[PDB]
């Protein structure tokens, strides 16, 4: 139905024929976020649309870290795209090459993932400490149809054993799950990343770009698009799109914009495609400084207002209110980037992560979680420096806190009432810095910039099938929805992969491109991977240990083992350490 | 061990860094087969070896009485190494396009499928054509074979693991003819085939999973590689017969020291260092092939040509170099030996084929979509007509049919002689007979309207001979510093021989190991570990029966299924089973 899914090298390496009649078509891409950028690259590369017919409408005209960071090997659509984007750092190489080599020579992993009691490593760090009841809850969730998970919370499907496991510590902090978030999305994550469970506790599965996501992913694509003549249109806010929703078709007819404070309108025909990135987790963000809190806001911005205006033209365009209203005041809102050249801080980090922060390699290898922090705070030092023109004596630490309405342990205030230096103080406290030194180090030996993001948890809010518009709604002729609030099967939002996937599916479907789209990696269907998951989830126990204290399963196991003794199934189980 | 297996787009699209010290290395590739050429291409593209330091050593120096077809078995999408290679090889047909791009577009424009797979009784379609007619016993035997460890199948034959129900099934007709399996062949390799291609079980009977090049293999695969290699300065050396390679074998090292060659009559010797790599294609299924013509049989032979002599000479220097005798010796005389290429512009023959395969042979698109099997032919004969013409110099009013017989020592039904005693025109008459041509016309249409070239291949079944782990050398034997074995008599995991993929796979593995290239090699496709594929396979193997139909007969299975279903009622597992038609 205008696209199909594939895997393996045949479809990966094959090139689509130029799509029919693309020469008389144009594209309008609302926003210059990564999904729109990705949709424009696919239009250039696989649609062979001329860049002059491709219009990226962005609101803006013309340290803080984190647009994105962690990636994995099985970002199948992202790597398809970025093998074709030249590096801005290596000659005759793609962003993929740069990244692939970088991560070979300095492969990621954490030497200390969770701390407590002011800088001590958690004694069970590395184990999931899941009881058999918790594991059963995990499988039961995977065995639940997604259809049966409308509006279901994480707390509805897990008991306290689960929430007391180390597993949950590692999972909620690395992915930013709150207990009230969508069990649907939690389920997709479990199945989506099962091949990396072996790397969950020590982040051995993660891979990072050289610099921040903008210097390493966005700018390369902007440059790719500029060299192909893509028209970037600034000072343009898209307020509405008039869509004709009939019994047989949906056609976007008109883009209503404010172009430099002036109300204008872009008339569309059936051959003008519109790519809407609906919803935004970064909109309405505010910034503090070392002595000022990022001020809280519940303002809807352009992105949310546009989706709401689209949603009033058809329920098939989604339900933005499920995502941008009723966000619990406890949710993550604040992140901070703390910069310092102070040797005591840097040295304290080294004595925890066991790596020289200033060496230019992995440091924390991903977030260290402060497990007994009131704020449920985690922080990471990536490869330093994360910016191109930053002094090589400086580190930049990124801090976030899952709980926003709880007094700190040292700064007895909610993070939303904290200046940069105060967030720094709470962090240094949990690092174990002598409290007699913390205040001055935060105020005069560091600079910490907080950001308040009202919608940073928005992707994970409990939802129902239908709350997210399909990438190409039923009967849509020239309208697609892209990014992490659009609907596609199996893949997990809050990833850059999801933004590139939806962009590729939108371009391919709307132009009818005759090439397969890589399916979400088939890990949860791979018996090899499933064998490993059991092994790892049970903290490296074989099937005899797993069933030890249970009469019913040790009898079923016995029967099974008599049946499989000396077979290939036995050999597989042994290779995967289950026997 | 100097490699790793991978899958997914990350490693597929990634480029390896230039391997360490490759500027001081050279390569010698014995022969111009596809594996050797494939290796040369990986040397260029991923090794970044200088072309002038790559030396292809080929016997031949650079007279047949008709077009000859072969080498062009089908391909499938999940030839993972092959497409990794040919995405990088320029098409000679389409500008600005790889061989993959050309193949890809062609097979979407003219997808392959068969409209008539098995005939009998002189041109009549098999009534059950389409079905596997597998009994539950037979199905249990297939599954029981896959659940057997490879190690316990040493020297086991296919007749040792299957019984009467299976051998009487359409499945086995389809299977044995399309893959050229003999009942005495390796059950280990049959097992690898079962698992290797389980994702295509739905395409077995109508060939809808097969893909074909535009032209014969040499024009579509080999010649693009040769021009890639020559454009990069690669050295081709003709008139070179390699007789032996001196290998110093020691506790911690195997090193090729010397290549003993006959170069245009003269006994010569290429001296090697550890930095000169040698790639050996050990054994050959086409070695010692002889040709006949429309009036002459291809004369039978037992000669061990150069390839089999070279391997025996290597096997003498270490048991890690394999057992060539398990493959080139004691080949049964009933084995497939003869194929033939029958070329005609005669409208009665062409129209007769059209009436069977339901397509115009001369339109330039799929014709038979792969072999048609004559199920009741004494010879167990099959024949295919690919897209026409398979040769760029051939007239547009001509077709060329490829014909083979699995049984070489059995009288024909019309020409009452074994195929080995038959002239090109006699093979054609036996073929025409089974097409339904009136016997009054068969002699004249085979003798004056057709030109049939037979080929006798002593070793054409040799890939499938019953073997034991260890008979095939590893692609890079343990501790080998500059010696690799490539092609379909070298050992790698899971993959299936008698396929171009296996040749390219070994090539890739050899080059990557010997040069320590830091990029993943695509694993054999993971279909046999894929629950969705295994579900589809149960459905298809039981001729599209959901599980309730499958268990009707066994009141106890009817029960076990009763329980399973309540354990999974309303769950994802149920939904998957319904999606894959088992409920
Ligand atoms: C701090 C942070 C860290 C992250 N880290 C990771 C990570 O480590 N790994 C990972 O996989 N993922 C991560 N993510 C998720 C990832 O960043 C997102 O999935 C992705 O960046 C979203 O891209 P998008 O363009 O689809 O969404 P957006 O970029 O939000 O798309 C909307 C954009 O278009 C513009 N726009 C919106 N509305 C309008 C309008 N009406 N008119 C004009 N312009 C408009 C806005 O400027 C906005 O930026 C992270 C996200 C954040 C916020
Ligand atoms: C496990 C394999 C790949 C996982 C995909 C990663 C993307 C996860 C996503 O939920 C966004 C993360 C949000 C911010 C949390 C802190 C960042 C920690 C981190 O970068 O992992
Ligand atoms: C696990 C048991 C498997 C059950 C039977 C498996 C059947 C495999 C079937 C079909 C393959 C059909 C042909 C696919 C491409 C062949 C390419 C070639 O000729 O080399
Ligand atoms: K899929």
């Amino acid at each position: 139905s205008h696209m199909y899914y594939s895997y393996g090298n045949y479809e990966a390496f094959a090139r689509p024929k130029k799509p029919e009649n693309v020469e008389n078509k144009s594209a309008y891409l609302i926003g210059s976020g990564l999904a729109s950028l990705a949709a424009a690259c696919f239009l250039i590369r696989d649609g062979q649309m001329e860049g002059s017919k491709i219009h990226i409408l962005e609101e803006l005209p013309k340290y803080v870290v984190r647009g994105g960071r962690a990636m994995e090997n099985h970002f199948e659509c992202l790597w398809d795209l970025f093998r074709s984007i030249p590096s801005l750092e290596i000659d005759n190489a793609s962003v993929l090459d740069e990244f692939y080599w970088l991560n070979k020579e300095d492969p990621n992993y954490s030497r200390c993932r969770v701390i407590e009691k002011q800088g001590q490593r958690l004694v069970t760090d590395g184990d999931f400490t899941l009881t058999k009841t918790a594991i059963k809850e995990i499988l039961d969730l995977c065995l639940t149809n997604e259809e049966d998970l409308d509006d279901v919370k994480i707390t509805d499907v897990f008991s306290d054993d689960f929430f007391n496991s180390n597993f949950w510590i590692y999972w909620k902090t690395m992915f930013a799950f709150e207990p009230w978030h969508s069990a649907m999305e939690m389920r997709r994550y479990l199945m989506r990343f099962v091949h990396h469970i072996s790397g969950l506790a020590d982040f051995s599965a993660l891979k990072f770009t050289k610099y921040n996501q903008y210097e390493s992913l966005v700018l390369p694509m902007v440059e790719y698009l500029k060299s192909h003549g893509v028209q970037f249109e600034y000072d343009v806010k898209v307020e509405d799109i008039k869509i004709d929703v009939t019994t047989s078709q949906k056609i976007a007819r008109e883009i209503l914009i404010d172009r430099n404070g002036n109300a204008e309108s872009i008339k569309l025909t059936i051959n003008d495609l519109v790519f809407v990135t609906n919803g935004s987790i970064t909109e309405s963000s505010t910034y503090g400084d070392n002595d000022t809190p990022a001020p809280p806001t519940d303002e809807l911005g352009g992105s949310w207002t546009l989706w709401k205006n689209l949603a009033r033209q058809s329920p098939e365009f989604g339900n933005p209110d499920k995502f941008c209203q009723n966000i619990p005041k406890k949710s993550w809102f604040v992140s901070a980037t703390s910069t310092t050249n102070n040797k005591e801080i840097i040295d304290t980090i080294e004595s925890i992560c066991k790596r020289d922060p200033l060496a230019g390699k992995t440091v924390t290898g991903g977030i260290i979680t402060i497990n007994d922090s009131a704020w449920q705070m985690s922080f990471t030092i990536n490869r330093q420096q994360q910016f191109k023109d930053q002094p090589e004596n400086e580190i930049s630490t990124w801090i976030y806190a899952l709980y926003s309405d709880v007094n700190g342990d040292y700064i007895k205030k909610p993070i939303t009432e904290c200046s940069g230096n105060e967030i720094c103080q709470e962090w240094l406290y949990h690092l174990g810095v002598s409290t007699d030194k913390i205040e001055d180090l935060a105020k005069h030996a560091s600079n910490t910039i907080p950001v308040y993001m009202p919608y940073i948890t928005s992707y994970f809010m409990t939802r129902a099938i239908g709350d997210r518009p399909l990438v190409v709604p039923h009967q849509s002729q020239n309208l697609a929805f892209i990014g992490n609030f659009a609907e596609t099967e199996r893949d997990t939002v809050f990833t850059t992969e999801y933004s590139v996937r939806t962009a590729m599916e939108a371009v391919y479907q709307l132009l009818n491109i005759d090439r397969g789209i890589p399916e979400v990696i088939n890990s949860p269907f791979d018996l090899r991977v499933l064998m490993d998951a059991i092994y790892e989830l049970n903290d490296h126990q074989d099937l005899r240990e797993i069933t030890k204290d249970s009469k019913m399963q040790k009898l079923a196991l016995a029967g099974f083992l008599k049946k499989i003794k000396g077979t290939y199934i036995e050999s597989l189980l042994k290779e995967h350490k289950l026997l």
Side-chain angles (χ1 to χ4, degrees), chain A residues 30-36 57-60 65-71 75 208 213 236-239 277 279-283 302-304 306 332 335 398 453 456 459 482-484 493-499 502:
Chain A
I30 292 98
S32 68
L34 187 124
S36 312
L57 312 175
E58 186 52 302
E59 226 155 347
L60 289 316
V65 279
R66 289 321 282 289
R69 273 312 111 80
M71 291 146 118
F75 280 13
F208 297 90
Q213 176 210 264
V236 50
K237 176 222 246 179
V238 176
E239 285 163 53
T277 307
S280 162
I281 63 180
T282 63
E283 199 158 73
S303 155
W304 286 107
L306 176 58
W332 174 22
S335 310
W398 185 78
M453 308 178 87
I456 186 50
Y459 286 153
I482 57 169
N484 278 248
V493 289
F494 222 149
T495 65
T496 50
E497 167 75 4
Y498 198 99
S499 296
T502 55

Side-chain angles (χ1 to χ4, degrees), chain A residues 338-353 355 357-358 363 379 381 395-397 399 424-425 427-428 431 433 437-448:
Chain A
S338 193
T339 304
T340 189
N341 53 40
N342 185 275
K343 206 203 194 293
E344 181 152 26
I345 301 186
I346 302 188
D347 275 7
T348 297
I349 298 165
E350 171 161 14
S351 65
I352 285 150
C353 82
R355 277 183 286 233
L358 305 171
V363 189
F379 64 92
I381 298 88
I395 66 172
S396 286
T397 299
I399 298 158
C424 189
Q425 291 191 58
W427 169 59
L428 291 175
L431 295 190
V433 178
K437 317 169 146 152
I438 281 169
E439 185 188 9
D440 212 58
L441 282 173
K443 292 208 165 91
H444 298 121
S446 308
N447 195 24
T448 306

Side-chain angles (χ1 to χ4, degrees), chain A residues 144-162:
Chain A
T144 308
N145 285 308
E146 169 155 305
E147 292 63 35
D148 296 337
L149 287 173
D150 281 3
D151 301 303
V152 169
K153 292 170 203 205
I154 290 175
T155 48
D156 298 318
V157 301
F158 292 101
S159 80
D160 302 78
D161 282 5
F162 181 76

Side-chain angles (χ1 to χ4, degrees), chain A residues 46-75:
Chain A
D46 296 349
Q48 295 198 45
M49 188 176 281
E50 278 268 350
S52 74
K53 310 272 221 75
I54 296 175
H55 310 269
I56 304 188
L57 312 175
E58 186 52 302
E59 226 155 347
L60 289 316
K62 184 189 58 36
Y63 305 73
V64 171
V65 279
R66 289 321 282 289
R69 273 312 111 80
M71 291 146 118
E72 62 142 349
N73 46 352
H74 293 300
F75 280 13

Side-chain angles (χ1 to χ4, degrees), chain A residues 67-176:
Chain A
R69 273 312 111 80
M71 291 146 118
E72 62 142 349
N73 46 352
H74 293 300
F75 280 13
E76 296 295 312
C77 297
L78 191 137
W79 299 133
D80 192 318
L81 169 61
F82 268 103
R83 50 129 184 188
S84 309
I85 309 298
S87 181
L88 304 199
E89 296 272 309
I90 302 154
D91 320 292
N92 300 108
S94 60
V95 168
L96 176 47
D97 294 332
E98 181 177 343
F99 177 103
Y100 176 81
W101 296 326
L102 169 59
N103 281 274
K104 251 164 200 296
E105 51 146 14
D106 173 22
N108 191 78
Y109 69 100
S110 177
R111 291 220 36 204
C112 162
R113 167 91 174 74
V114 183
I115 58 178
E116 49 168 20
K117 298 190 194 314
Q118 290 74 49
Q120 304 182 350
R121 196 174 173 203
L122 186 79
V123 200
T124 48
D125 201 3
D127 314 304
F128 293 155
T129 58
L130 291 153
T131 66
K132 271 43 180 162
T133 294
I135 294 167
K136 186 79 184 119
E137 282 174 3
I138 287 168
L139 305 192
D140 283 17
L141 178 53
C142 294
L143 296 172
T144 308
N145 285 308
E146 169 155 305
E147 292 63 35
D148 296 337
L149 287 173
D150 281 3
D151 301 303
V152 169
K153 292 170 203 205
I154 290 175
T155 48
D156 298 318
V157 301
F158 292 101
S159 80
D160 302 78
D161 282 5
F162 181 76
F163 292 122
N164 293 319
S165 76
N166 288 356
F167 179 91
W168 173 240
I169 297 161
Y170 306 132
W171 187 267
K172 86 199 193 151
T173 57
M174 79 185 287
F175 295 135

